[PDB]
Amino acid sequence: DKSVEFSYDELATATDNFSLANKIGGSVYYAELRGERAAIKKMDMQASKEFLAELKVLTRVHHLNLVRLIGYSIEGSLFLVYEFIENGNLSQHLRGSGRDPLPWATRVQIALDSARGLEYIHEHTVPVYIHRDIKSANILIDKNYRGKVANFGLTKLTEVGRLVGTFGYMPPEYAQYGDVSPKVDVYAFGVVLYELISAKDAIVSKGLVALFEGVLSQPDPTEDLRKLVDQRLGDNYPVDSVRKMAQLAKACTQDNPQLRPSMRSIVVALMTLSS
């Protein structure tokens, strides 16, 4: 339908024929479309497969913690139009330059926001989704520092040997066997929790998960855990909340996928170690 289908001319006029001035990321262009701030992404492809109808179902997903697919354009090249999230992504806030450090309380709220979004697509959408590419760069931040999960349901574009995923976020059963389940997302979310605690990259030579595993394997991990906490936080964090988050992330990144918690249980826990 044209309430969700955009003509190329409407997008070109709104981007000044895709001027470099309107680029925001990537190949992403900012535009104001039908009274909404939007982010237009050129996909170097096109498909009247069920993906067109799969794009239709994607546009009906509406959640405060998911980046909404506003619409699309099938005039030739595939254009996906998304709501514009104005304050970057979590990876930039944790490690990118120019930005102040996130307070611990704000990091907990972002974790809770992201988990609620994942809980919704795991349990409540029709149909349910597995994201398969959760990572800090896919958590976008608004002006009030609330989090929104981006780029879910976009897997057929990649798969249709190959693998979907990002280095540092894939669980052992997927890397070694190709097994896909919602627990793939749980594992990756655990890595994000470790990034929130440490502000280290998912990579570094060393993976975050093994570094925390060795620390948490100690009788009293508190002294070694403090070394792993983001130095930009200083002493401004509750030690028990960080411990609870670290232990939750450890449970999320266990080898056995059947023993990782569900997103619903993850939400409950994060509300406990809240802020």
Map 26-82 to HEC letters: CCEEEEEECCEEEEEEEECCCCCCHHHHHHHHHHCCCCCCECCEEEEEECCCEEEEE
The answer to whether domain 8-83 and domain 90-272 are alike in fold is no
C-alpha span between 265 and 119 (Å, rounded): 9
Which CB contacts under 8 angstroms, 24+ apart, belong to 229-234? Answer: 229/197, 229/198, 230/94, 230/101, 230/197, 230/198, 230/199, 232/101, 232/199, 233/101, 233/103, 233/104
Separation CA 213–CA 231 (nearest Å)? 20
State yes or no: 42 annotated in a binding site.
yes
Number of Cβ within a 10 Å radius of residue 186: 25
Structure determination method: X-ray
Quote the DSSP letter at residue 175.
H
Q: Three-class SS of residue 239?
A: helix
Question: How far is C-alpha 1 from the chain's CA centre?
Answer: 28
What residue type is 42 in one-letter code?
K
Resolution in units of Å: 1.9
Q: Where are the domains of the chain?
A: 8-83, 90-272
Name residue 228's amino acid.
L
> Taking the domain 8-83, which CATH number applies?
3.30.200.20
Rounded distance, CA 147 to CA 117, Å? 9
Active site residue 133: yes
Looking at 9, 16, 44, 133, which residue is catalytic? 133
Residue pair 222/243 in contact by the 8 Å Cβ criterion? yes
Query: Cα–Cα distance between 90 and 265 in angstroms, integer?
Result: 23
In angstroms, the CA 42 to CA 45 distance is: 9
Q: Of 88, 80, 91, nearest to 153 (Cα)?
A: 80
Give the fold, CATH level 3, of 90-272: Transferase(Phosphotransferase); domain 1 (1.10.510)
Residue showing tokens 């409540």: 124
Eight-state DSSP code of residue 261: P
